[PDB]
Design an enzyme around this catalytic site. Structure first.
Site, PDB file in Angstrom:
ATOM      1  N   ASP A  12       0.827  -1.198   0.000  1.00  0.00           N
ATOM      2  CA  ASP A  12       0.000   0.000   0.000  1.00  0.00           C
ATOM      3  C   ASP A  12       0.865   1.252   0.000  1.00  0.00           C
ATOM      4  OD1 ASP A  12      -3.129  -0.735   1.789  1.00  0.00           O
ATOM      5  OD2 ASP A  12      -2.633  -0.588  -0.349  1.00  0.00           O
ATOM      6  N   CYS A  16     -10.955  10.289   3.731  1.00  0.00           N
ATOM      7  CA  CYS A  16      -9.826  10.705   2.914  1.00  0.00           C
ATOM      8  C   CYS A  16      -9.954  12.175   2.538  1.00  0.00           C
ATOM      9  CB  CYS A  16      -9.745   9.844   1.655  1.00  0.00           C
ATOM     10  SG  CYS A  16      -8.585  10.451   0.417  1.00  0.00           S
ATOM     11  N   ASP A  44     -11.504  -0.078  -3.870  1.00  0.00           N
ATOM     12  CA  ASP A  44     -11.247   0.226  -2.467  1.00  0.00           C
ATOM     13  C   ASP A  44     -11.613   1.673  -2.174  1.00  0.00           C
ATOM     14  OD1 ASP A  44     -10.175   0.748   0.097  1.00  0.00           O
ATOM     15  OD2 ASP A  44      -8.125   0.884  -0.678  1.00  0.00           O
ATOM     16  N   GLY A  91     -13.964   0.199   4.482  1.00  0.00           N
ATOM     17  CA  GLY A  91     -13.511   0.682   5.770  1.00  0.00           C
ATOM     18  C   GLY A  91     -14.632   1.057   6.719  1.00  0.00           C
ATOM     19  N   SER A  92     -15.329   2.162   6.424  1.00  0.00           N
ATOM     20  CA  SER A  92     -16.223   2.780   7.403  1.00  0.00           C
ATOM     21  C   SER A  92     -17.411   1.895   7.761  1.00  0.00           C
ATOM     22  CB  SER A  92     -16.716   4.131   6.883  1.00  0.00           C
ATOM     23  OG  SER A  92     -17.601   3.971   5.790  1.00  0.00           O
ATOM     24  N   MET A 119      -5.586   6.284   7.891  1.00  0.00           N
ATOM     25  CA  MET A 119      -4.211   5.906   8.192  1.00  0.00           C
ATOM     26  C   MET A 119      -3.239   7.040   7.902  1.00  0.00           C
ATOM     27  SD  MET A 119      -4.415   3.096   9.588  1.00  0.00           S
ATOM     28  CE  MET A 119      -2.892   2.158   9.600  1.00  0.00           C
ATOM     29  N   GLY A 120      -3.665   8.038   7.131  1.00  0.00           N
ATOM     30  CA  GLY A 120      -2.853   9.209   6.881  1.00  0.00           C
ATOM     31  C   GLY A 120      -3.264  10.401   7.722  1.00  0.00           C
ATOM     32  N   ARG A 166      10.188   7.601  15.778  1.00  0.00           N
ATOM     33  CA  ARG A 166      11.240   8.298  15.048  1.00  0.00           C
ATOM     34  C   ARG A 166      11.914   9.353  15.917  1.00  0.00           C
ATOM     35  N   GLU A 204      -3.397  13.460   5.142  1.00  0.00           N
ATOM     36  CA  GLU A 204      -4.306  13.268   4.019  1.00  0.00           C
ATOM     37  C   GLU A 204      -5.544  12.494   4.462  1.00  0.00           C
ATOM     38  OE1 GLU A 204      -2.579  12.086  -0.023  1.00  0.00           O
ATOM     39  OE2 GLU A 204      -0.915  13.188   0.890  1.00  0.00           O
ATOM     40  N   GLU A 249     -34.548  11.527  -5.708  1.00  0.00           N
ATOM     41  CA  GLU A 249     -35.671  10.616  -5.903  1.00  0.00           C
ATOM     42  C   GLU A 249     -35.307   9.188  -5.514  1.00  0.00           C
ATOM     43  OE1 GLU A 249     -36.928   8.911  -9.987  1.00  0.00           O
ATOM     44  OE2 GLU A 249     -38.376  10.524  -9.641  1.00  0.00           O
TER      45      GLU A 249
HETATM   46  C1  8L1 Z   1      -3.493   6.633   1.979  1.00  0.00           C
HETATM   47  C2  8L1 Z   1      -2.866   7.774   2.199  1.00  0.00           C
HETATM   48  N1  8L1 Z   1      -3.197   8.842   1.472  1.00  0.00           N
HETATM   49  O1  8L1 Z   1      -4.183   8.779   0.493  1.00  0.00           O
HETATM   50  C3  8L1 Z   1      -1.790   7.924   3.228  1.00  0.00           C
HETATM   51  C4  8L1 Z   1      -1.477   6.938   4.159  1.00  0.00           C
HETATM   52  C5  8L1 Z   1      -0.455   7.175   5.079  1.00  0.00           C
HETATM   53  C6  8L1 Z   1       0.241   8.386   5.062  1.00  0.00           C
HETATM   54  C7  8L1 Z   1      -0.078   9.359   4.118  1.00  0.00           C
HETATM   55  C8  8L1 Z   1       0.629  10.682   4.065  1.00  0.00           C
HETATM   56  C9  8L1 Z   1      -0.208  11.629   4.920  1.00  0.00           C
HETATM   57  C10 8L1 Z   1       2.011  10.541   4.702  1.00  0.00           C
HETATM   58  N2  8L1 Z   1       0.659  11.188   2.688  1.00  0.00           N
HETATM   59  C11 8L1 Z   1       1.475  10.816   1.692  1.00  0.00           C
HETATM   60  O2  8L1 Z   1       2.322   9.952   1.864  1.00  0.00           O
HETATM   61  N3  8L1 Z   1       1.297  11.448   0.515  1.00  0.00           N
HETATM   62  C12 8L1 Z   1       1.993  11.259  -0.650  1.00  0.00           C
HETATM   63  C13 8L1 Z   1       1.676  12.000  -1.784  1.00  0.00           C
HETATM   64  C14 8L1 Z   1       2.381  11.814  -2.974  1.00  0.00           C
HETATM   65  C15 8L1 Z   1       3.415  10.885  -3.059  1.00  0.00           C
HETATM   66 CL1  8L1 Z   1       4.282  10.701  -4.621  1.00  0.00          CL
HETATM   67  C16 8L1 Z   1       3.732  10.142  -1.929  1.00  0.00           C
HETATM   68  C17 8L1 Z   1       4.799   9.112  -1.793  1.00  0.00           C
HETATM   69  N4  8L1 Z   1       5.493   8.765  -0.688  1.00  0.00           N
HETATM   70  C18 8L1 Z   1       6.372   7.766  -0.956  1.00  0.00           C
HETATM   71  C19 8L1 Z   1       7.223   7.286   0.182  1.00  0.00           C
HETATM   72  F1  8L1 Z   1       8.222   6.554  -0.274  1.00  0.00           F
HETATM   73  F2  8L1 Z   1       7.705   8.334   0.826  1.00  0.00           F
HETATM   74  F3  8L1 Z   1       6.475   6.574   1.006  1.00  0.00           F
HETATM   75  C20 8L1 Z   1       6.479   7.215  -2.235  1.00  0.00           C
HETATM   76  S1  8L1 Z   1       5.296   8.120  -3.126  1.00  0.00           S
HETATM   77  C21 8L1 Z   1       3.025  10.344  -0.760  1.00  0.00           C
HETATM   78  C22 8L1 Z   1      -1.098   9.122   3.216  1.00  0.00           C
HETATM   79  O1  IMP Z   2      -5.832   8.529   5.763  1.00  0.00           O
HETATM   80  C1  IMP Z   2      -6.068   8.123   4.630  1.00  0.00           C
HETATM   81  N1  IMP Z   2      -6.101   9.035   3.600  1.00  0.00           N
HETATM   82  C2  IMP Z   2      -6.656   8.681   2.392  1.00  0.00           C
HETATM   83  N2  IMP Z   2      -7.188   7.423   2.205  1.00  0.00           N
HETATM   84  C3  IMP Z   2      -7.160   6.520   3.208  1.00  0.00           C
HETATM   85  C4  IMP Z   2      -6.601   6.852   4.435  1.00  0.00           C
HETATM   86  N3  IMP Z   2      -6.708   5.770   5.238  1.00  0.00           N
HETATM   87  C5  IMP Z   2      -7.320   4.774   4.555  1.00  0.00           C
HETATM   88  N4  IMP Z   2      -7.605   5.225   3.290  1.00  0.00           N
HETATM   89  C6  IMP Z   2      -8.267   4.492   2.193  1.00  0.00           C
HETATM   90  O2  IMP Z   2      -9.668   4.527   2.384  1.00  0.00           O
HETATM   91  C7  IMP Z   2     -10.197   3.179   2.390  1.00  0.00           C
HETATM   92  C8  IMP Z   2     -11.434   3.111   3.256  1.00  0.00           C
HETATM   93  O3  IMP Z   2     -12.481   3.891   2.699  1.00  0.00           O
HETATM   94  P1  IMP Z   2     -13.985   3.772   3.215  1.00  0.00           P
HETATM   95  O4  IMP Z   2     -14.471   2.361   2.996  1.00  0.00           O
HETATM   96  O5  IMP Z   2     -14.812   4.685   2.344  1.00  0.00           O
HETATM   97  O6  IMP Z   2     -13.997   4.340   4.616  1.00  0.00           O
HETATM   98  C9  IMP Z   2      -9.014   2.333   2.826  1.00  0.00           C
HETATM   99  O7  IMP Z   2      -9.156   0.967   2.477  1.00  0.00           O
HETATM  100  C10 IMP Z   2      -7.840   3.024   2.136  1.00  0.00           C
HETATM  101  O8  IMP Z   2      -7.766   2.646   0.771  1.00  0.00           O
HETATM  102  K     K Z   3     -36.689   6.377  -3.399  1.00  0.00           K
HETATM  103  K     K Z   4     -12.886  11.501   0.426  1.00  0.00           K
END
Ligand code: 8L1
Ligand code: IMP
Ligand code: K
Ligand code: K
Ligand code: 8L1
Ligand code: 8L1
Ligand code: 8L1
Ligand code: IMP
Ligand code: IMP
Ligand code: IMP
Ligand code: K
Ligand code: K
Lengths: 356, 355, 368, 358
Positions: free
Chosen positions: C131, C188, C221, C244-245, C271-272, C284, C298, C352
């Site tokens: 992921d 998200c 997903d 998820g939800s 998770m973000g 860390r 995010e 509707e």
């Molecule tokens: C699902 C999800 N969000 O939907 C999510 C889950 C955990 C953490 C984050 C955080 C808040 C940390 N957000 C990003 O990590 N955003 C982001 C945006 C664009 C890129 Cl290109 C990358 C990348 N990071 C990597 C690394 F190697 F560092 F892991 C490879 S590519 C990352 C987001």
């Molecule tokens: O913090 C996050 N930022 C963006 N997407 C996430 C994050 N955590 C989980 N997700 C995604 O959202 C899905 C759950 O969506 P849901 O079923 O609509 O609540 C997960 O299976 C992940 O793919």
């Molecule tokens: K209806």
């Molecule tokens: K959303």
């Protein structure tokens, strides 16, 4: 498949594009035509409703260069007397007067009220407004021919319409202006009760194109919520705008102030509502009975409205209305564009005079 | 029949498509051009408003790599004093500070039409850029003002606005501006589209103006309408070189204006420059309001730039010029918008970049 | 001169048209493929989130024929322990088992976490779920190639993606399934924070058309709000759905019940989000002892109502899918995708479709 | 790629265009056909629901010129008695009901609902003198429904049969060829319906009517527009598109004559209203409707009066002397979200009660 002729737009669907401008808002000219033979110094008309226009509201409208239409939900003698109080009326330099120096005034009539027309003509009414829920009807068209045949020099407005074919029919019957608007009114339920209507921007556009072939002006009646809608209606090709709700909560409108939960309001109701029809004389209404906030004098409301029109014209670079309609170019916008256009993400703390 | 030029879109009508990425958000470079000559180390500018930018906020924006534009709602002497307070200010804490050739913080100042006296004084004060703003940039008064200023000060960088059409961009560029500011109606406190019916949705306005300004090598500033960091990414991805922001910075320590408490929460005033309070009958084109207190400009700017870096990572862009070449959009629906936001879950903790 | 590729739609923009039907909802088959080599007996997967899936949730999902993915917000030894609790575990006649009769389970991993993969394989994990916020990236593709070279027999899911070109890259990299979803999740904020995303129905449709050329299943997903969105996602061409939800408020999900204004809830967060990332920033910091850069999240932290057992939720969700396949006349998921025809609807058509003009007095088990 | 057949519209997406009119709303004629062989004198049917139509409601609907369909959530003997109570009711009132909808013997007409495979129920309803049987399913385009239609027409060739519900031209063609005397149109539009949310299946009602009328007209088979009627203007829209009649649930559930008692909540009076696919009506199950409440609105006669007054006003706007002329003349515009807010009451607080709008 059903017949869907077009996708129709209303005010909130469009915005005017800015153009190169060499004019300032305070320099533009906002005179226009009400009918083929009557001019207005500013393009606003107060609606012919018993919570909007009697003699107090009509006098102020004319003093400011526009017009008021005395509503018809009263007996003939009371309407005659309201007309005469307007006709008998430096601080109002733009006053819209007739050849004798008297304020100009309109009066509403319905089908089959020739006695009312006779008495209002004798009272010196400047224009007769033949209104109906459905102006594109045999009764209205026959009534137009009858009035014109008996009073050739009486300026006559007929409405309401929302199609080009309707505008052609009324123009060929001999009207001096057509009034456009089926369904847009703030207090109107016609579109919900009967399912009939045309969004006002498209209705104006469709009717202006036809009426122009007869040199007949279009009055845009209903749905004005902000000064910006006045600008849009005029830019699409309307010659004047009739307004109801934005003037119903003023000092000059009939009806008294009342207090509800700490604030002051006036009544505002459709003429096709149960309350308006029952005072006049099981009914199926096409309007509601409501209230609007008290907003002070008509003069200050009108000042903000025309101030918005002047700003608009300044953005487009137009020296007068005809230039405004020539230069006007629009964009169609989305729901998100509408939200961006309004105030957003900021709590308002001070009352704005032109935005509520 | 009425002339409808196009169906115009704003920020929430579109999203960027992700692309193959080899870059990481913390390593991309976000330098850009403010005018044809002046660069920024990061692409944000604080608005020239009397609830947003005086000397304190202008110093922080410059220290962080951007720019602050002193508002013109003060006499000439006070504006000169504000500008000089920025130029005198200044270092391992601010390694991206936007400085001029003499190691001084860069700062801009807003002027109106026919205010040559003001231009003379801000030049002698050492201003880096003059921002000629008006409600209607595509006007004879602005165009003449541009010609008169560039004739007297050929080396003074001049920004003029605001505009929303390519024809407006062509006029200002031929008049000799060094940057155009795009935005008629999108501002949070702006009522111009409601009061006058005039405006262009911001994404389409940027798109239209950049195509024409690029022919003259003139950068486009996207002014107004930013609500989230993602809007900054879309504006730059469309071709804007920088973004001017008001509401998101009004609730900070460094903005002018008093902190006050209202029903248990702290706020600051935020008002349009075309509102009754700012201009003191008058016909306003803005409203007077308040925004919640959010803390320092630094923490806000950090989150906004983090969103931008994240977006460039998703697109695979190493810098903003590569961002604009790779960027591809989809148009979305109202349902798509609702899906994009948080939905069907009650938010219980504050998020620094989402409200 | 900006580049608008297409007009993209989500679940609420479309509805399935009914078709001639000789099948009854109780008779249709809802088995499907999770990867090229692992089947499911029903198409539901619980999300790899620390408010959704640990060993309790994963056990129940497999017992009902689906799959649970242990989240990765824990150290390797803890994730190994969760996997073994599931592997260790005729009231469940549709249980999803491996060749040795053990419940199937998945486990999430991140970019470059080979040490985590080695320990999960040793614990008998059935599928590893790689992921990233951005699956269409060099880090993901390099990790897919290194895992496949080291563990050729290990089934690997990678995500998340939203474009055809992303699906092509991961398939050529050798994944056994791609997971689709950039932005649709209930919690998200990616599309708002970064402006990046593709409406989920269009993302599935574009990715399925490309992944099908490789015979690689697509996991849809995020963004599932009702049982009808499960039907739509499968009809468009997805092979499974990750949720998820709808599962966070269950007995089996991690986290305790709490009361707010007379009713019960469970925590649910991205998770973000700041909360989910706090624990890693704590490790860390103590390791190096350095002032760390403030996180830019995010996702958000919230709560969902308590809804009882995962069994009752899955029963209602699967009931909606069986009802949909009855309306379309489909004997199985493959037949469902062959027959499915959609209409695009308006915002007024959406109103509707929902309950309108009537105050709900008793809450339905499958509608809020 | 996924197959997207069309972009479908519902009531709120369109508006009728006014046309030149020589007719007054008072003078138009609103008779129509229920089936190939049964006429109505006004085009409204009350829904086959245990919170809408038992004998009291069906009596008033027939007295006013329409029809009521006795619901099937009761044993056979109970349904037979409900039908008998209507057939033996006085049709005239205190010239009070001059448009009463009667059979050949001067008795009020009445319908009764049935499910798949309930032949014993059909036989008992026939003996009771039912005028029309309504075979309703969640999915009328099914082998079970087709087979039941064929079995009923084989045993009772002269019994008028309605079948539904459907939402596609292919479904209309199937039922017509099976031998129905009318098709009922509506998958998902119902106020209490959750089918589209639970299963993702449905067609917006205006497009669904349009599609099924075009097919069903080829067989001379009327279309009943079932569900989603919120206002009198929706009735006008459905008929103008080609539907021969309209079946209504929520707007009649709050009346005196509907089953169930009045109750008070927060100072206002309500009656319960629920989908027949809701948990309460069906008694683990998977429901496709919800249980709810609607405001008390008085007599069916006052509700029906305002609904027909809206249709009469609509036909006057279009210039139509009757329903068939309504459908020939009717032209539509498609509107936007902003056009709907302009259509409703806007910017003004409603103070008094409107009998046909809230
Ligand atoms: C699902 C999800 N969000 O939907 C999510 C889950 C955990 C953490 C984050 C955080 C808040 C940390 N957000 C990003 O990590 N955003 C982001 C945006 C664009 C890129 Cl290109 C990358 C990348 N990071 C990597 C690394 F190697 F560092 F892991 C490879 S590519 C990352 C987001
Ligand atoms: O913090 C996050 N930022 C963006 N997407 C996430 C994050 N955590 C989980 N997700 C995604 O959202 C899905 C759950 O969506 P849901 O079923 O609509 O609540 C997960 O299976 C992940 O793919
Ligand atoms: K209806
Ligand atoms: K959303
Ligand atoms: C403006 C308006 N908006 O609703 C309105 C104003 C007052 C009263 C009504 C009432 C509630 C009485 N509603 C109708 O009058 N509705 C209606 C509907 C359809 C037609 Cl075709 C006609 C016609 N009126 C005439 C006339 F008598 F004027 F000649 C000929 S045909 C009338 C409506
Ligand atoms: C940014 C903005 N947004 O509303 C705004 C800011 C401050 C004040 C105003 C007010 C409320 C005063 N509104 C106008 O100034 N409105 C307006 C409308 C139309 C035109 Cl054509 C013009 C012009 N001004 C000039 C000048 F040279 F004087 F600058 C040339 S043309 C001006 C608006
Ligand atoms: C009207 C209505 N609206 O939802 C409704 C009324 C009562 C019960 C249901 C329930 C909640 C039970 N929902 C279904 O019955 N849903 C459904 C979905 C798809 C199909 Cl294909 C079928 C079929 N059932 C049959 C049978 F013969 F068994 F009756 C033949 S076809 C049924 C729905
Ligand atoms: O009861 C009614 N039903 C429908 N339209 C009405 C009714 N009464 C007045 N109107 C129209 O609505 C206009 C005022 O609309 P407003 O300015 O939006 O409130 C009037 O000038 C009439 O044309
Ligand atoms: O009162 C006004 N009326 C219209 N626009 C304004 C007014 N005052 C400021 N603006 C514009 O709105 C921008 C701020 O928009 P924001 O970032 O959305 O709050 C400023 O930079 C100006 O371009
Ligand atoms: O529970 C159910 N699920 C789906 N549709 C239903 C259910 N019960 C009744 N209906 C339909 O909904 C119609 C009433 O819709 P209404 O007029 O909008 O309330 C009925 O005539 C049936 O066709
Ligand atoms: K705005
Ligand atoms: K209205």
């Amino acid at each position: 498949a059903m017949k869907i002729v077009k996708r129709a737009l209303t005010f909130e669907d469009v915005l005017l594009r800015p153009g190169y401008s060499e004019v300032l808002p305070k320099e533009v000219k906002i005179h226009t035509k009400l009918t083929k033979n009557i001019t207005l110094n500013m393009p606003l008309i107060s609606a012919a409703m018993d919570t909007v226009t009697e003699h107090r509201a009509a006098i102020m409208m004319a003093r400011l260069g526009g017009l008021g239409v005395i509503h018809k939900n009263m007996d003939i003698a009371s309407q005659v007397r309201e007309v005469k109080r307007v006709k008998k009326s430096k601080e109002y330099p733009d006053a819209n007067k007739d050849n004798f120096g008297r304020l100009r005034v309109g009066a509403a009539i319905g089908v089959g009220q020739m006695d009312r027309v006779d008495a209002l003509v004798e009272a010196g009414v400047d224009v007769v407004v033949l209104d109906s829920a459905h102006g594109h009807s045999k009764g209205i068209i026959d009534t137009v021919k009858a009035i014109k045949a008996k009073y050739p020099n009486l300026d006559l407005i007929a409405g309401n319409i929302a199609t080009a074919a309707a505008a052609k029919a009324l123009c060929e019957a001999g009207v001096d202006a057509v009034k456009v608007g089926i369904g847009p009114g703030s207090i109107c339920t016609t579109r919900i009760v009967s399912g009939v209507g045309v969004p006002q921007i498209s209705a104006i556009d469709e009717c202006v194109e036809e009426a122009n072939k007869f040199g007949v002006p279009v009055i845009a009646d209903g749905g004005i919520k902000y000064s910006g809608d006045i600008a849009k209606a005029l830019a699409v090709g309307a010659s004047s705008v009739m307004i109801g709700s934005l003037l119903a909560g003023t000092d000059e409108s009939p009806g008294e102030l009342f207090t509800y939960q700490g604030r002051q309001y006036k009544s505002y109701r459709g003429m096709g509502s149960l309350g308006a029809m029952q005072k006049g004389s099981k009914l199926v209404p096409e309007g509601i009975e409501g209230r609007v906030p008290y907003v002070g004098s008509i003069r200050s409301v009108v000042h903000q409205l025309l101030g918005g029109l002047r700003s608009s014209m300044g953005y487009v670079g137009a020296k007068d209305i005809e230039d405004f309609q020539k230069r006007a170019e629009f964009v169609e916008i989305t729901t998100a564009g509408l939200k961006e256009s309004h105030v957003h993400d900021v709590t308002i703390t001070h009352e704005a005079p032109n935005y509520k």
